[PDB]
Symmetry: C5
Subunit: 376 residues, 5 copies
């Protein structure tokens, strides 16, 4: 992920022009290769036409160039690219929203599962670790970065997501399916055992825990669904053919013909086809953005940081359920203990942001005295 | 379903061009027939015009070809295709989202329904089997692949979804409606009986089970709704007429007239109408993708694997409620038992994915000392 | 509703072309009248121009026809139709989703409300009948088909939705508003009475019932809202004027002028304006689809089958709460009682649908031994 | 609100053409003023050009008219109008959906809060009145019609939404913010007091009440948000400039120049610019619809009837919690008491709506005997 | 935020034209700089072409100007701007919806947490202060205005969001991550302690509190997600290049060439390129609106008032849980105590808003007596 929120906080002069200089995660990094191939092909063909064809062959080539340029506008490139890119961007944000975060579950585990002794610590750590293990199993199933970090369940055991006992249990349970759902059944059974043993004081708290864990299960299921049900191959194929056919045609149709022939549209020959190159930029960059976002769990620069998410989730969840359990800051009267209307101060930098409260759009409507009396 | 997520993980050079070689679930498999018919018609008409018409008839044909080519741009093909394809793709993903997965319910059944004895096993298996039977009844109602696998409720009994007792009960209950809703009433009644008999220890757990089962019922209802309320036939008819009328016109309007007459736009005759064929590719492929996705439960290559979903659900749900009930891995202190900040290792392949935590967009804003003091 | 899901299950050759022959719920049934009026007007005007105007009047008419044809492209017909049709289709599916189905509530009533005696039967039937009566009150308020079936609350009493006692109570309660909300207050009060009398064993079960009934109330409220807050009349007016103005202009602009004058674009005169008629098909059919879907509870062919929904809901809900209460099939061990991995059989027709499980997109990534070792 | 659902129930001949005659809430009412100003300006300029300019000045004016007409197509009017109108219509329906209805809460209050005595009546009326008072406080904040009805909290007291005691309490609580949230804290505290005093028998019922009231609070918050966070002024400004610039240009570019000069596109002069006026109709009517819907709580004809909603909510909620509390119709066996398959009758008008049940799309698939046998 | 809801309440004559005069938050404030640079460049180039080039150089410049003007229409500016602006405006409203409001939680805390003594006051204030502290931690992470107000956690302590004890606890807990999630674990633990100590009377009330707090946690997580996962830099880059390339081309292509040469499209030279400047207005204003909304938590005029939201939330939440706890207005019979149908009065200004109730669209359907009789 490349973050430029801080840069674009305000609408300054040339706000985006400044971002134009970024290289990492830039359109330049995606284009440069295809663009270099296109430029090489274009100039090879130009040199062929100028220095390797007879007069009759040059007449034939010029006829072909006028034909290609006249009929290129048939390809529905904007049509197909618009559809495809909208689908990919919608799916991309959905995929992000389905990334599971233990935070809600971890607060509820830290609260409800009771005991400062070894058994209480072990139970809390085990429940939150089951949540993290479920998440990491689905992530290594759908994400190339995570898979390269944990190319096997033995790697999961060596990295402390999974104990050797859990590894043996998973091996015993093995079906010909992705076993990412197992930790959720383990969580349900361990929560029930905790409640029966009096560590969870009430079935309403047990239900709360199970609801949070089941929300995580639904998110993991959505990740698996997006990973499995790709955007139809047929759509991908059609968009690829649209863009490539358009620019293969441009290789001939955007040749600068001999100015002598004075062909309409070829009066001026600039050796560099500026507008053809700009269209390459737009259309091929549009498709390459789609290529980069179609699987956000790849290793692109703008792909999600699944590895970081995994490490952060493990650290935060273990801290929340172990060190932060019944470990609260001293509860003392606050700054505004007997101040009916607290007014926190503003710094010099933020003093201009002090606003009068918005009271509703109807506040400033003025009516006559006669307009206000109720009628019988 | 054709999955190419792994291929398109990163934004490599020619990432989609590589997918262009796929045949199974390809646009080529959908087009080749209609395209062959179109090509045969186009070349029959070209041979008629060149080798079977007098001079006067050729003048009339050329007038007709100029008329057709001038006025083809009237058909709102992009207009109608865009609307129709957006509707079909939205409905396609919705239909996927309504596929019911027992996972949440199966974890709750495995937890809450108590007893390692025969009666406990039988009760758990029966409840999760009711969930699977409801799902398979709706799927055989809406899916041709599932229906071909289970062309009758007796097939359901022979395949172990339904016991002979359940078959007799369903036959007794028969109304002139789809009986897919019966297993949900059976589930409610059996859950209530389990609670009254003390196998479910608390009404809050009973409510949790019923909520999960009712979510599954809503998903099945949405499947039935999508199967029943087709995209309006009138929209389907209008899009079909748009595409077919456009290409029937192209058969005449995209003839290459005699270059001798030097008709504007007909200066160069390539025997093969490259741009007409490319538009065929785009527009007819667009409509054929819509044809393939309009019912995702058909037997197309890109259609959903409902049979696989059914088999996986049965195996996983029965395992979860029977073998995995109160069968947990040994609970032992984890790798990070006294490590305040766990740091799972990275492999050589994934070492580059180790990132610094994102701390918020405002992190790097620098202010003067004077800018920070609170004002009174 | 016209259903063609079964026909379009697969992407066969001419899949939609086959649907083109449907008459009932077809675009032809919607167009034929307006199309006949348009054709009559067009040919009246053509005969006027050819056989009732002097030479000077024909020059004036030809000038008018060139003017109309040159400036018709000003009307933003595609602009306005796209917007309007998208709004109507979105609202159409929303209206469907707001159709209330008793299924969830009926399973919960059949479960929780206890007693095989007369009083238990009467209580269960009364609660589910209140759900159905609320639904049918809103449906007769918003649906012309339902209203024609039940033109009065006395019809509701004669048809067995409403008892004479309920009719008297409703008459006593009468306010100057739609009384469709009354059965929900009745349901709440009767559920509370059932709980206080011990027929509902627990307040958690009472809360479950009330949540299901309140979901039904929200759906009914959405139906009432869609029925009340029409698409703004101004949008309807603008789209109607767009389409009618476009084709009124076409009556003059799409005349075939005298070929003798050799007016550009009028070289060839086909007595039948094929492209004008095709545009009529597309644009007027687009608007007529909008006309048909704007109120899906009308009596069109593609309108919802509200009457069928009402009858099915009553039959199914009464069966579920009365005959199916604590009436379960014999609970016996299933086919896979001691089969760790059940494998339901495939028929000859479905054998090709047996797939290998999808294991995740990262499954087939191969790494070197060196790429896998954890780094310190 | 203008309702024409009943008119457009079916897809009749000229279904929308009939609506074209509506005046109230019509596009005519919105346009007539701006259209009259535009027509006056256009004909003033035409009379200037024809009767107040020399020959040289007329040559200059004709050059200007050709320039304006050639380059008007630069303004992206359809671009900007499409975006703006889509945003306004989405926000308009959202604003409707956020209108709070007490129905769910009122059924739960009528059920759960117990007692037919004076104290029970007073408690139920007070709780539902707190719900209505919260709603009316937010509505008078966001709606000009409601504000004109209740220009002060003293008006709220005189109209019976607020008691003098509540008015004093609100005055004591006054902060420099909209106090619309106060009744929700009052509701929470009074519900807790009712539960502690035994009027609400169970904390699960207390939680149900609080959830319904908190849903209402979220809806009120969304209303306040839409009222506060307007569509960006910059978007409003850009759309206004687009439309006005387009038609200011049309005043000159759509002049009918002297037919003598025989300027291309000016061969025929109709004194009335039909297509310019039709574009005025479409584009300015599009913007005026946006103007009318941008604040749906104004006093336009198509604006919401907030006053009616307020009055209906008060009447219905007070009836539901006071007269309808434990006041049920006599519970007697229904018409279908021992009819296993009820079949409610159809009238002569609705007999054609009797349908055969939809059994699923796969119902009519026929397979050979050999196609059905399970394979080993 | 700039609010003009009150102004645009009705569809008056020139409703938006009146808003055109606004400066603060206007399109003028965003454009004036870029527009001045563009105008300076355009007129520098015009003066170069008119007063610094030979005749041959002027022929070359005119050829270049015709080339640029002919081929500018290649840049897909409307294509790319439409996509980008739709994404930014959808994100913008989502970001608003994720702003957390304590209202629901504060009503539940004020209700459920019991005790008018010092310990009860302290517990209620602490819980609601944890909610506010979590919100302000996320807001100072994602918002430049909030960060400038609280450039450090010590500023948070000085402003009364955080006690010194909480500051020490946070410092002890410090991980290499944003610690905004800590107050939610603190809230869970303090709620559990309150329940165990009998201040919260029931675990169902404890579950209600935790659900409200967890909703707030999800909203804060969404804010963090939007702040972290920017719109892809590649999209931003492509849109910026589209707009800048288009207007850099316009600097040459929209020169008014010498009228003497009588170049087509250059017959009339107005020194000011009105349509080029209008396109600048539209396209650059479109992009600048996107620049302003891409981060709504910046310091733009149309950016959210996060500081005001923070101050209002603190004041309201502390009032609700401290002064308003078990402090209800006297419960007395209302105005309509024995009025079966309350009819609140209308003022003179609002008398026209008294409407007849909407009874459903089917109300006015008239049927014959024969049409109504049920058939057997
Ligand atoms: N003949 C032409 C060749 C190339 C270009 C261009 O730069 O896009 C324009 C015209
Ligand atoms: N006259 C023509 C016939 C066919 C084509 C084409 O290849 O699309 C172009 C021109
Ligand atoms: N002058 C014309 C009249 C009619 C048509 C047509 O068929 O659409 C085309 C040209
Ligand atoms: N020169 C013209 C003036 C006006 C119109 C028109 O009616 O739209 C058309 C051409
Ligand atoms: N040659 C031209 C230069 C500028 C303009 C314009 O004002 O947009 C139009 C034509
Ligand atoms: Ca990627
Ligand atoms: Ca299919
Ligand atoms: Ca209809
Ligand atoms: Ca309004
Ligand atoms: Ca900003």
């Amino acid at each position: 992920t490349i973050t430029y929120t801080s840069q674009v906080a305000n609408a300054r002069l040339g706000s985006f022009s400044r971002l134009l200089l970024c290289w990492r995660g830039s359109i330049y990094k995606l284009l440069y290769g295809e663009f270099l191939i296109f430029l090489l092909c274009y100039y090879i063909i130009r040199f062929i036409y100028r220095l390797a064809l007879t007069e009759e062959q040059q007449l034939m080539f010029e006829k072909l160039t006028l034909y290609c340029d006249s009929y290129i506008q048939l390809i529905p490139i904007s049509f197909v690219l618009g559809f495809y890119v909208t689908l990919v961007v919608t799916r991309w944000w959905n995929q992000y929203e389905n990334l599971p975060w233990p935070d809600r579950l971890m607060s509820l585990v830290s609260g409800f599962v009771e005991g400062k002794d070894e058994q209480g610590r072990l139970l809390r750590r085990t429940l939150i670790r089951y949540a993290n293990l479920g998440n990491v199993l689905i992530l290594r199933s759908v994400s190339t970065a995570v898979y390269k970090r944990f190319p096997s369940a033995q790697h999961l055991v060596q990295a402390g997501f999974m104990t050797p006992a859990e590894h043996k249990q998973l091996e015993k349970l093995s079906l010909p399916h992705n076993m990412f759902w197992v930790p959720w059944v383990w969580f349900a059974n361990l929560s029930m055992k905790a409640w029966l043993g009096g560590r969870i004081r009430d079935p309403i708290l047990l239900q709360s825990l199970l609801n949070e864990m089941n929300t995580l299960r639904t998110q993991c299921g959505h990740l698996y669904a997006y990973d499995w049900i790709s955007i139809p191959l047929v759509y991908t194929q059609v968009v690829t053919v649209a863009v490539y056919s358009f620019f293969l045609t441009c290789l001939v149709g955007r040749q600068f013909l001999n100015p002598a022939k004075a062909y309409p549209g070829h009066e001026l020959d600039l050796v560099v086809p500026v507008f053809t190159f700009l269209q390459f930029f737009f259309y091929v960059g549009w498709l390459k953005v789609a290529e980069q976002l179609i699987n956000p769990f790849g290793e692109d620069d703008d792909d999600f940081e699944t590895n970081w998410i995994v490490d952060r989730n493990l650290q935060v969840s273990l801290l929340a359920v172990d060190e932060m359990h019944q470990d609260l800051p001293r509860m003392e009267p606050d700054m505004y203990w007997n101040k009916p209307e607290p007014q926190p101060p503003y710094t010099a930098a933020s003093a201009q942001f002090r606003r009068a409260s918005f009271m509703g759009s109807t506040f400033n409507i003025s009516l006559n005295k006669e307009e206000m009396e109720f009628q019988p």
